RNA sequence: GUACGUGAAAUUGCUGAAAGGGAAGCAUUGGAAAUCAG
RNA sequence: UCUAGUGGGCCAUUUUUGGUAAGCAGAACUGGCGAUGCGGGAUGAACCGAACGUGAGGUUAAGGUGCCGGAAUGUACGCUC
RNA sequence: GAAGCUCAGACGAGUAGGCAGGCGUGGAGGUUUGUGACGAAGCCUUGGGCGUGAGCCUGGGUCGAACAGCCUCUAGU
RNA sequence: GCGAAACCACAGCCUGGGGAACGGGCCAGGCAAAAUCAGCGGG
RNA sequence: GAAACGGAAGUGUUUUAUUGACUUGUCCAUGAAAUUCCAAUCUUGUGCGGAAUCGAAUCCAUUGCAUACGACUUUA
């Protein structure tokens, strides 16, 4: 079953590009006269529940695997029964020695590692 | 420094910090004398000091008088800031001396990099100045490949 | 144009022509 | 764990219904491939394709499978086919060899096969047998050997939706 | 050398659009030689082709190709609708396209 | 219906806007168009009516620094180009590029007088305007509002027609000779069953 | 390196790239160049 | 049973007495608008259609099919210089 | 994970306002044999991924000592 | 050579139209080629 | 290898003799293939080892017919 994303571009906040104080994160326009709130033609779009993706393919990487954050050897050892569903994600703050230890363990379990090249 | 050069292979460096000169004039002189030969830059600075040539003003060109000596650079506006040139002349003396210390060939030196940055305002606007001198120097698919094969046999 | 005036009636005229036509019809009704 | 067994799909297979004018023994233009624009005589009616050849002594188009969507069935006079057997041409007869891996390349792979080495002598025996059984028919009616030797091409002011091929 | 051109010359006119809206999903193709919808039924389903040239050379071949299919006649004057795998760029209005005689049905 | 690289249109007897509308469509269609013999273009309405239509155009000029104001081109080629330009989205890059594919010249210059000149029946005066309807030629209408090259173009046209007629007489002499030899061959009527 | 831990933004300069005929910014669709990803 | 927010105005129709060069005023009613984006009318607070999750395809409304602009420089009968 | 699984149908503008579920921040109790000088937090990034969204995970660079997930409490959030 | 401040949503060609206030952004046109120097201050 | 003509923007036209081809007008023989169902012209380029080629403008200065400064008119 192919993974499908309804939308790829993120919803940028209104005027988040003309100002450095207004941030990229989405905020809902509150103004009564906002041409964006009234959803005029040509204006940027607003997040709606209609863009929700399929429940069967939601939270899945482009290869159909869900990410699970792993911080020590114990975590990946818990992933042995879902090598077909969950791919391990080494946490950023895991030391070099533990990373090679986890990645060798994950290889033994045959569980996918997304950032094994570190 | 600012740029990937200044490798000790064929470079020499100099810099000045908190030099009591206007930032905009120093920028215009730096832009002009960039890329010239070292000895060529010296006489040019001597010319500017003696009004026999002028440094074009390009970005900070507000209110500059038009002179005929700005014709070589293609601009209409020129000025002769002598304070900033004296600062640049001293800096080039030091950069030339550093070239002597490293052991380059001084006849073929060029101004490879020069940059003027604003300094902590103290009012006047001091300028950090830095100079670098240096030296100059698919596939074949089954069908596409088969046609290549047949045409190879065709020529023979 | 080619004329001594503008053929495009400005929206004021598009506004008050119809109502003054309506007042005319009301006058005949009275 | 899951290995979701596919539901028993209710799709069957039925013989492909070729066009009315794509009968064996006709003359058709070839629209694609390395021999686009050539004219070739259809020998036999395959499952999906047409086992078609130009008489190799005439134009040099060996016996090939061609999908019927890249064929224009000309109304040229029919060439008899009862004189030649056509059962020996099957899908497996035309099929490729295996590959033994997903990737193979290099000019050594090109100096091999070629129309000498991986080309069996039995194919020429079949090819010459076909030519022996069709040249008398093509020779009988005029311009036919010359018609098949030529190539089809459009011209300025030639509109295919009005041209009755 | 006139023993070639197994295609039919055509032109890209615009996208399918209203006056203030465009849908680049489908493109309006003027198949040269076709002057009504009953004639455009012939080319309905053929393989249309946009051929262009680039700067980088992939395959050692300077020509890139964007494939497409004639989908529906569009109007009275013999224009058709085409669906290209990649929507044609807007710089290609008036650019010439090719109409292959296949999938053949004649 | 079929495109060439370049089309050279002889614009004698064609209506101004009727021809300019077709040309506007062909330019955006992506084809180079050369319009020749512009000084015989026709416009509906009697001459004095159209003379007023153009003398009102002379009235439009910016009151501040009229060098900024509208430029009222007088040459017949330039009047035709004005018609086409107003029928194009020239305020864009695709409209701008359509003008660059349009050539409008008065008379037929030597670069083009040796090529076939087609006409546009959707714009021909004899097929559009009812007989007895007054009309004015652009070439006359330009020679009365400033264009000062009417006579020279007419002078050069007369010479060109003489050369073109001499060519045609030579081509007819050759063509009648081959036609005699064309019919002389016997194979003609052993292919006559094919309609040729 | 005492104008001393980390050193953000506004802001300035240099290099590289790109665009620009009385603005720009933004959105949709693709092309081109760069760069990834399975 | 308890408990938020609102208690304006504008536009047009229908009635409607006083009325005058002429508008104007008076009520009652109706809808629409405030909270409403979209298609069309060159553009527009009210005109014509249409009441909105994300998309694909098909078909239409209003309005249009010379060109700008997607769509007949269509067919037929007249009027108009 | 009965707070779960499953099938079916209809519906989807929205101001004041009414209701529900979530994202994020400082500190507290509990838990994860939790992460860390073989580099914590922070910071940069034309690197990658996830969510409709609030936001979240990660690669590379800089950095040098502390920090986080979960269930609850709390507020100068 | 020394060297400010007021001010600053963003900007700066023109005609007509946009219910109003018709405007600098909208619509329809006229058009439109860098960088500047000095006067007049029209706006 | 040459003649003639073409000035509206001459984008060429023609006469040619020449050479070397090519040589379906017509009829024959060789070869194509496992690319075994679709996916010539255009110029830089960079150099090749052989030929020949040997200009101007401005600043500096000057003039005053010109001039706020540029610019302009001279001289050099």
From Swiss-Prot, chain C:
Q: Which domain of life is it from?
A: Eukaryota
Q: Where in the cell is it found?
A: Nucleus, Nucleolus
Q: What happens when the gene is disrupted?
A: 20-40% of cells exhibit morphogenetic aberrations represented by irregular, uneven, or overdeposition of septum material as well as septation and cell separation defects, often resulting in pseudofilamentous or multiseptated cells, suggesting a failure of cytokinesis in those cells. Cultures of null mutant cells did not appear to exhibit a growth arrest.
Compositional bias segments (type: Basic and acidic residues)? 15-25
According to the UniProt entry, which residue ranges have a biased composition of type Basic residues? 1-14
Q: What is known of its domains?
A: In contrast to other GTP-binding proteins, this family is characterized by a circular permutation of the GTPase motifs described by a G4-G1-G3 pattern.
Q: Which family does it belong to?
A: Belongs to the TRAFAC class YlqF/YawG GTPase family.
Protein function: Required for optimal growth. Required for normal processing of ribosomal pre-rRNA. Required for nuclear export of ribosomal protein rpl2501.
* Name of the protein this chain belongs to: GTPase grn1
Q: What's the gene?
A: grn1
Full protein stretch here: 3 to 32 of 470
Swiss-Prot record, chain D:
- Report the subcellular localization: Cytoplasm; Nucleus; Nucleus, Nucleolus
Family statement drawn from the similarity comment of this UniProt entry: Belongs to the eukaryotic ribosomal protein eL6 family.
Kindly indicate whether the keyword Nucleotide-binding belongs to this entry.
no
One GO biological process term:
cytoplasmic translation
Name the keywords, alphabetized: Cytoplasm, Nucleus, Phosphoprotein, Ribonucleoprotein, Ribosomal protein
Its source organism is Schizosaccharomyces pombe (strain 972 / ATCC 24843)
The opening ranks of the lineage are: Eukaryota, Fungi, Dikarya, Ascomycota, Taphrinomycotina
Partners and quaternary state? Component of the large ribosomal subunit (LSU). Mature yeast ribosomes consist of a small (40S) and a large (60S) subunit. The 40S small subunit contains 1 molecule of ribosomal RNA (18S rRNA) and at least 33 different proteins. The large 60S subunit contains 3 rRNA molecules (25S, 5.8S and 5S rRNA) and at least 46 different proteins.
Q: Which superkingdom?
A: Eukaryota
* Phosphoserine carried by residues: 75, 85
The gene that this protein is the product of is: rpl6
The principal location of this protein is cytoplasm
Q: Report the GO terms under cellular component.
A: cytosol; cytosolic large ribosomal subunit; nucleolus; nucleus; preribosome
Task: Specify the protein name.
Answer: Large ribosomal subunit protein eL6
The Gene Ontology terms for molecular function here are:
RNA binding; structural constituent of ribosome
Curated annotation (Swiss-Prot), chain E:
The biological processes this protein is annotated with in GO are: cytoplasmic translation; ribosomal large subunit biogenesis
**Is Transcription regulation one of the keywords UniProt gives this record?**
no
GO MF, one annotated term = structural constituent of ribosome
Give the subcellular location: Cytoplasm
Tell me the domain of life.
Eukaryota
Please provide, in alphabetical order, the Gene Ontology terms of the cellular component aspect for this entry: cytosolic large ribosomal subunit; preribosome
Q: Which residues carry this modification: Phosphoserine?
A: 96
Q: What are the protein's UniProt keywords?
A: Cytoplasm, Phosphoprotein, Ribonucleoprotein, Ribosomal protein
**Gene3D superfamilies linked:** translation elongation factor selb, chain A, domain 4
* UniProt cross-references to InterPro entries, sorted A to Z: Ribosomal_eL33, Ribosomal_eL33_CS, Ribosomal_eL33_sf, Transl_B-barrel_sf
Xref: HAMAP family: Ribosomal_eL33
Look up the further comments and give them. There are 2 genes for eL33 in S.pombe.
Query: Briefly, what is this protein's role?
Result: Component of the ribosome, a large ribonucleoprotein complex responsible for the synthesis of proteins in the cell. The small ribosomal subunit (SSU) binds messenger RNAs (mRNAs) and translates the encoded message by selecting cognate aminoacyl-transfer RNA (tRNA) molecules. The large subunit (LSU) contains the ribosomal catalytic site termed the peptidyl transferase center (PTC), which catalyzes the formation of peptide bonds, thereby polymerizing the amino acids delivered by tRNAs into a polypeptide chain.
The record's similarity note reads:
Belongs to the eukaryotic ribosomal protein eL33 family.
The name under which this protein is listed is Large ribosomal subunit protein eL33B
Question: Per the UniProt entry, what species is this protein from, by scientific name?
Answer: Schizosaccharomyces pombe (strain 972 / ATCC 24843) (Fission yeast)
Curated annotation (Swiss-Prot), chain F:
- GO-annotated molecular function: mRNA binding; structural constituent of ribosome
Q: Which is one Gene Ontology cellular component term of this protein?
A: ribosome
Q: Which UniProt keywords apply?
A: Cytoplasm, Phosphoprotein, Ribonucleoprotein, Ribosomal protein
The record ties this protein, via InterPro entries, to: Ribosomal_uL13, Ribosomal_uL13_CS, Ribosomal_uL13_euk/arc, Ribosomal_uL13_sf
Compartments it resides in: Cytoplasm
| Positions bearing Phosphoserine | 192
Classification via NCBIfam families? L13_A_E
Q: HAMAP family from the xrefs?
A: Ribosomal_uL13
Which function does this protein serve?
Component of the ribosome, a large ribonucleoprotein complex responsible for the synthesis of proteins in the cell. The small ribosomal subunit (SSU) binds messenger RNAs (mRNAs) and translates the encoded message by selecting cognate aminoacyl-transfer RNA (tRNA) molecules. The large subunit (LSU) contains the ribosomal catalytic site termed the peptidyl transferase center (PTC), which catalyzes the formation of peptide bonds, thereby polymerizing the amino acids delivered by tRNAs into a polypeptide chain.
Q: Which family does it belong to?
A: Belongs to the universal ribosomal protein uL13 family.
Q: State any further remark.
A: There are 3 genes for uL13 in S.pombe.
Q: How does it assemble?
A: Component of the large ribosomal subunit (LSU). Mature yeast ribosomes consist of a small (40S) and a large (60S) subunit. The 40S small subunit contains 1 molecule of ribosomal RNA (18S rRNA) and at least 33 different proteins. The large 60S subunit contains 3 rRNA molecules (25S, 5.8S and 5S rRNA) and at least 46 different proteins.
Provide the protein name: Large ribosomal subunit protein uL13B
